[PDB]
Design an enzyme around this catalytic site. Structure first.
Site, PDB file in Angstrom:
ATOM      1  N   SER B  29       0.278  -1.115  -1.617  1.00  0.00           N
ATOM      2  CA  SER B  29       0.065   0.024  -2.494  1.00  0.00           C
ATOM      3  C   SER B  29      -0.087  -0.409  -3.937  1.00  0.00           C
ATOM      4  O   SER B  29      -0.244   0.438  -4.819  1.00  0.00           O
ATOM      5  CB  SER B  29       1.218   1.019  -2.361  1.00  0.00           C
ATOM      6  OG  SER B  29       2.463   0.399  -2.637  1.00  0.00           O
ATOM      7  N   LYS B  72       3.087   8.308  -6.574  1.00  0.00           N
ATOM      8  CA  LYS B  72       2.761   7.327  -7.606  1.00  0.00           C
ATOM      9  C   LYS B  72       2.809   7.959  -8.991  1.00  0.00           C
ATOM     10  O   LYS B  72       3.336   7.360  -9.939  1.00  0.00           O
ATOM     11  CB  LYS B  72       1.383   6.722  -7.350  1.00  0.00           C
ATOM     12  CG  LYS B  72       1.212   6.124  -5.975  1.00  0.00           C
ATOM     13  CD  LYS B  72       1.973   4.830  -5.842  1.00  0.00           C
ATOM     14  CE  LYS B  72       1.603   4.128  -4.557  1.00  0.00           C
ATOM     15  NZ  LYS B  72       1.921   4.979  -3.385  1.00  0.00           N
TER      16      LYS B  72
END
Lengths: 72, 72
Positions: B29, B72
């Site tokens: 990620s 995020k």
């Protein structure tokens, strides 16, 4: 009392080759971790004695990585 | 493009370090995180913090989407 069990001042022992007086907080009173590292010519790797953890090995690796940037 | 030398897959190592040993989020990620980090450390030019990043890298040079944009 008899014989002083400990040195009066720690500024009287010697400078040693592979000695670094660490610092730590053991739940039984603070004490300096005398981490001792010996370098021997050979294959080239990290011998990991004295019951290291993961983070301890990573710190050793980090120290070597910085020392590799500036060696001369 | 980034002032790099012609050969830097052989000439220079890359000791990489991540503060999380396992996958905090499964799969890379933070692919462009390492893209930026490696580009900065190999071109010897700093990397602007206060500007976070996230994504995935594919070898063609394309930022594939990532899940959990909200997180995020």
């Amino acid at each position: 009392l008899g014989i002083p069990r400990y040195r009066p001042d720690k500024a009287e022992t010697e400078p040693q080759v592979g000695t670094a007086q660490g610092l730590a907080w053991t739940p039984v009173g603070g004490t300096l971790l005398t981490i001792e590292v010996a370098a021997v010519p050979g294959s080239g790797k990290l011998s990991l004695t004295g019951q290291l953890g993961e983070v301890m090995k990573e710190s050793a690796q980090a120290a070597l990585t910085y020392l590799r940037a500036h060696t001369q | 493009d980034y002032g790099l030398p012609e050969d830097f897959y052989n000439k220079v190592d890359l000791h990489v370090h991540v503060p999380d040993g396992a996958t905090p989020k499964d799969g890379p990620s933070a692919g462009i995180t390492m893209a930026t980090a490696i580009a900065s450390a190999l071109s010897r030019r700093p990397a602007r913090m206060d500007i976070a990043m996230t994504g995935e890298v594919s070898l063609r040079g394309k930022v594939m989407p990532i899940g959990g944009v909200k997180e995020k």
